[PDB]
Amino acid sequence: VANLKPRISFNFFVTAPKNVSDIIPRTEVEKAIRMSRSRINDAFRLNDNSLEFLGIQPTLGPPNQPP
Amino acid sequence: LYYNTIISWIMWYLFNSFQEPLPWSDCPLYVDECARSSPVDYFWYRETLNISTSISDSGSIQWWML
Ligand SMILES: *[C@@H]1O[C@H](CO)[C@@H](O[C@@H]2O[C@H](CO)[C@@H](O)[C@H](O)[C@H]2NC(C)=O)[C@H](O)[C@H]1NC(C)=O
Ligand SMILES: *[C@@H]1O[C@H](CO)[C@@H](O)[C@H](O)[C@H]1NC(C)=O
């Protein structure tokens, strides 16, 4: 984690467990966050709008009322 | 003749008033036209009127309007 601000902003990346030279590319981290975002948001009472991963856009909004 | 077309439009909006998220509340997944301006401006000119760009441009009787 880097660049912690009072805005509650910061940057993060991920590395392999016992290898500081291995950095998981962003694409895999984006896919992982997309998979577990419902759980990560619920762990912080956040709702995707409140918890924003810049570069990762929420795409799950199904609208339907009158069939 | 024209006051009964305006009442025609009023009762089209009264029939569409039975939906918790009223149909002029959100954008149709999002139409660039609707994305510009607002959903309300989109429900009137497209969803309700299917309006043209000129008086020289007439088309098909809007069945729901009829
Ligand atoms: C830790 O991760 C780094 C980065 O992936 C590894 O360094 C690469 O290792 C591969 C496999 O030996 C080589 O082909 C690359 O040329 C290395 N260079 C890079 C990408 O940094 C490193 O070997 C890993 N080692 C451990 C202890 O897990
Ligand atoms: C009216 O609606 C039809 C689709 O039902 C569309 O093809 C046509 O271009 C519309 N006309 C206008 C002028 O909006």
From Swiss-Prot, chain A:
Superkingdom of source:
Eukaryota
- Report the subcellular localization: Cell membrane; Cytoplasm; Cell projection, Cilium; Apical cell membrane
Q: Which residues of the full protein are shown?
A: 672 to 738 of 805
Please give the tissue specificity annotation from the record for this chain.
Expressed in endothelial cells from small and large arteries, and in arterial smooth muscle cells (at protein level). Expressed in enterocytes of the small intestine, Leydig cells and Sertoli cells (at protein level). Expressed in the renal proximal tubule and the small intestine (at protein level). Expressed in heart, kidney, testis, and gastrointestinal system (at protein level). In lung, expressed at low levels in some alveolar type 2 cells, the expression seems to be individual-specific (at protein level). Expressed in nasal epithelial cells (at protein level).
Question: How does it get modified after it is made?
Answer: Proteolytic cleavage by ADAM17 generates a secreted form. Also cleaved by serine proteases: TMPRSS2, TMPRSS11D and HPN/TMPRSS1. Phosphorylated.
The protein's assembly and partners: Homodimer. Interacts with the catalytically active form of TMPRSS2. Interacts with SLC6A19; this interaction is essential for expression and function of SLC6A19 in intestine. Interacts with ITGA5:ITGB1. Interacts (via PDZ-binding motif) with NHERF1 (via PDZ domains); the interaction may enhance ACE2 membrane residence. (Microbial infection) Interacts with SARS coronavirus/SARS-CoV spike protein.
Q: What does this protein do?
A: Essential counter-regulatory carboxypeptidase of the renin-angiotensin hormone system that is a critical regulator of blood volume, systemic vascular resistance, and thus cardiovascular homeostasis. Converts angiotensin I to angiotensin 1-9, a nine-amino acid peptide with anti-hypertrophic effects in cardiomyocytes, and angiotensin II to angiotensin 1-7, which then acts as a beneficial vasodilator and anti-proliferation agent, counterbalancing the actions of the vasoconstrictor angiotensin II.
Q: What is known of its domains?
A: The extracellular region of the ACE2 enzyme is composed of two domains. The first is a zinc metallopeptidase domain (residues 19-611). The second domain is located at the C-terminus (residues 612-740) and is 48% identical to human collectrin.
Give the induction note: Up-regulated in failing heart. Expression is induced by IFNA and IFNG. Exposure to cigarette smoke increases expression in lungs. Expression is decreased in nasal and bronchial epithelium of individuals with allergy after allergen challenge. IL13 stimulation decreases expression in nasal and bronchial epithelium.
Which family would the database say this protein is a member of?
Belongs to the peptidase M2 family.
Q: Which residues form a coiled coil?
A: none
Question: This protein is called what?
Answer: Angiotensin-converting enzyme 2
Q: Where is this region: Essential for cleavage by TMPRSS11D and TMPRSS2?
A: 26-45
Which residues carry a glycan?
Answer: 19
Swiss-Prot record, chain B:
Mark the transmembrane ranges: 1-15
Tissue specificity statement from the Swiss-Prot or TrEMBL entry: Robust expression in kidney and small intestine, with minimal expression in pancreas. Also expressed in stomach, liver, duodenum, ileocecum, colon and prostate. Not detected in testis, whole brain, cerebellum, fetal liver, spleen, skeletal muscle, uterus, heart or lung.
Task: Give me the Extracellular side stretches, as residue ranges.
Answer: 16-60
| Protein localization | Cell membrane; Apical cell membrane
Q: Which residues are glycosylated?
A: 50
Assembly mode: Interacts in a tissue-specific manner with ACE2 in small intestine and with CLTRN in the kidney. Interacts with CLTRN; this interaction is required for trafficking of SLC6A19 to the plasma membrane and for its catalytic activation in kidneys. Interacts with ACE2; this interaction is required for trafficking of SLC6A19 to the plasma membrane and for its catalytic activation in intestine. Interacts with ANPEP; the interaction positively regulates its amino acid transporter activity.
The UniProt family comment states:
Belongs to the sodium:neurotransmitter symporter (SNF) (TC 2.A.22) family. SLC6A19 subfamily.
The entry's linked illness reads:
Hartnup disorder: Autosomal recessive abnormality of renal and gastrointestinal neutral amino acid transport noted for its clinical variability. First described in 1956, HND is characterized by increases in the urinary and intestinal excretion of neutral amino acids. Individuals with typical Hartnup aminoaciduria may be asymptomatic, some develop a photosensitive pellagra-like rash, attacks of cerebellar ataxia and other neurological or psychiatric features. Hyperglycinuria: A condition characterized by excess of glycine in the urine. In some cases it is associated with renal colic and renal oxalate stones.
Functionally, this protein is described as follows: Transporter that mediates resorption of neutral amino acids across the apical membrane of renal and intestinal epithelial cells. This uptake is sodium-dependent and chloride-independent. Requires CLTRN in kidney or ACE2 in intestine for cell surface expression and amino acid transporter activity.
Protein name as annotated: Sodium-dependent neutral amino acid transporter B(0)AT1
Organism source for this protein? Homo sapiens
Q: Indicate the span of the full protein covered.
A: 127 to 198 of 634
